[PDB]
Design a protein around this ligand. Structure first.
Ligand SMILES: OC[C@H]1O[C@H](O[C@H]2[C@H](O)[C@@H](O)[C@@H](O[C@H]3[C@H](O)[C@@H](O)[C@H](O)O[C@@H]3CO)O[C@@H]2CO)[C@H](O)[C@@H](O)[C@@H]1O
Ligand SMILES: [Ca+2]
Length: 504
């Protein structure tokens, strides 16, 4: 019958791997991480999908999707399915009072609350169901959904592990506080009423916990981030990932293999999909003047022989100051983990036509190499865990909250820039400085869109980036695009759901 341990483990496993699956989906495409990541990244200023022919990619890239959007449905169906599983577990263990089950239920309610946030943040409403049954989910709009989420988190806190006391991979009170802080920071968006004071309060609780910032930014996204204390100390909520276990159906697989192509030095994998690369605007977060970006001159030819090894590739790049470490030095920021070297071919910073992977610089933030230099478990699938929740979010969140209230946010911003060994310290905080910092600190971590919406820059002219709105130099779009549409399939199946404003 009911396998409490098995169902509990699946609850967390759903965050980082696929068994919710739909026709037209390749390996692991229904994934919770991939679907949510694409909805918050592909339409942003952080990256571009190289294969514009793939279905619905042009729509997501340009922010011009419709209710029939395949990717919108993929993430909608996944978020919903996951919740049905959390409701199943909670119903099957109702009434149990043993210590572990109390923690398990608290954590499951946490995961459910997290999924509703995604619904809230992405659709502004959600197909709501508290229990597992055949009854059609009822629609729960913004503010009501907001209050429900905040209440869930407030009530389970007591039964959750203390900060850094839960097995690595499970959520604790700090994960609860960080999420509430996120809800508060976006309260104005979801309710129409801001609550920056509360955002600061909880961000502070997190900062006050045992969690500390990793001293080496890159280590947070490496194969051993679940064994390297320096990294573990900052990862409040990691999605466990292991080469031989998760294999090709995980999230970090998408992050590492997806941003690489044969020829690049230290691929960390045998299969580079050459799918994800940065938009010119992303590069600009580290180089206000794109002319300062280390690049191979056009008049310099790329040898067709003598560049088959990492050793040969690094030397050629070094000769021309285009190794990623040179990129970091030119940027004066440890987070400028970009690659403009010759590995994989001549790169462009900006393009006037999305034709291929090389039309932009490569992003090497995610790596399948251990900081301790020891062997990883697999040659193709990465061991790198996805640090979904990081202490750094608390700092940027409180920084913005403080700024929004009219206070001095310089301290929290310089705390992250200092950790990143930035040569430039922020003297005064501004809206632009903040939103740019969110990009620098969390780019390619699946949250960009949400931040852009809050700053009122996602659909508007307040901020134009390359390829935004389908225009090469960037153009605005209808404001109703700040919320994805309700998949037309669910509109036809659940008479309780109503389409979001704007869509037809
Ligand atoms: O290798 C030549 C092929 O290059 C292009 O295929 C792309 C896909 O379009 C892109 O989505 C990605 O596919 C991966 C897929 O998304 C993932 O679910 C699966 O598990 O791995 C796939 C990669 O093996 O990357 C591939 C390869 O770059 C092109 O569209 C295709 O027609 C070419 O045959
Ligand atoms: Ca791991």
């Amino acid at each position: 019958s009911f396998d409490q341990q098995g169902v509990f483990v699946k609850g967390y496993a759903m965050l980082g791997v696929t068994g919710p699956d739909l026709d037209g989906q390749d390996e692991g495409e229904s994934g919770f991480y991939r679907t949510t990541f694409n909805c918050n990244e592909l339409p942003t200023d952080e990256c571009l999908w190289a294969w514009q022919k793939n279905q619905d990619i042009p729509q997501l890239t340009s922010i011009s999707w419709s209710p029939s959007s395949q990717r919108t449905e993929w993430v909608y169906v996944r978020l919903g399915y996951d919740i049905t599983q959390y409701n199943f577990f909670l119903d099957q263990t109702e009434g149990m009072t043993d210590a572990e089950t109390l923690r398990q239920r608290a954590e499951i309610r946490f995961l459910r609350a997290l999924h509703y946030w995604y619904f809230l943040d992405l659709f502004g409403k959600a197909p709501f169901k508290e229990h597992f049954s055949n009854d059609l989910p009822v629609e729960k709009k913004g503010t009501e959904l907001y209050t429900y989420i905040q209440n869930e988190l407030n009530e389970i806190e007591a039964d959750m592990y203390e900060p850094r006391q839960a097995p690595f991979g499970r959520a604790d009170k700090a994960a609860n506080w960080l999420l509430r802080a996120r809800l508060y920071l976006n309260a104005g968006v979801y309710t129409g009423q801001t609550d920056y004071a509360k955002a600061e309060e909880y961000a502070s609780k997190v900062i006050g916990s045992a969690y500390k910032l990793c001293t080496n930014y890159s280590e947070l996204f490496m194969a051993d981030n679940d064994e390297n204390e320096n990294a573990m100390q900052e990862i409040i909520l990691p999605i466990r990932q292991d080469g031989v276990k998760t294999r090709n159906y995980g999230g970090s697989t998408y992050l590492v293999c997806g941003t690489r192509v044969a020829g690049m030095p230290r691929m960390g994998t045998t299969n580079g999909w050459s799918c994800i690369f940065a938009r010119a605007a992303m590069v600009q977060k580290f180089f206000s003047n794109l002319e300062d970006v280390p690049m191979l001159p056009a008049d310099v030819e790329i040898p067709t022989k003598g560049l088959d090894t990492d050793e040969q590739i690094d030397a050629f790049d070094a000769e021309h100051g285009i190794r990623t470490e040179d990129m970091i030095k030119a940027a004066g920021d440890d987070r400028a983990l970009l690659y403009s070297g010759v590995g994989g071919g001549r790169r462009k910073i900006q393009t006037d036509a999305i034709s291929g992977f090389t039309d932009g610089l490569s992003i090497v933030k995610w790596q399948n190499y251990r900081s301790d230099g020891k062997p990883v478990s697999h040659a193709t699938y990465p061991d790198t865990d996805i640090p979904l929740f990081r202490l750094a979010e608390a700092y940027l969140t409180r920084a913005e909250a403080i700024f929004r209230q009219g206070g001095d946010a310089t301290g929290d911003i310089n705390e992250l820039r200092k950790r990143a060994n930035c040569t430039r310290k922020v003297q005064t905080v501004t809206e632009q400085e903040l939103i740019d910092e969110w990009a620098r600190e969390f780019y390619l971590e699946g949250r960009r869109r949400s931040d852009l919406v809050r700053f009122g820059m996602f659909t508007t002219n307040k901020y134009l980036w390359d390829w935004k709105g389908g225009a090469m130099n960037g153009t605005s779009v209808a404001s109703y695009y700040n919320k994805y549409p309700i998949p037309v399939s669910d509109i036809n199946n659940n008479r309780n759901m109503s389409q979001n404003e704007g869509y037809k």
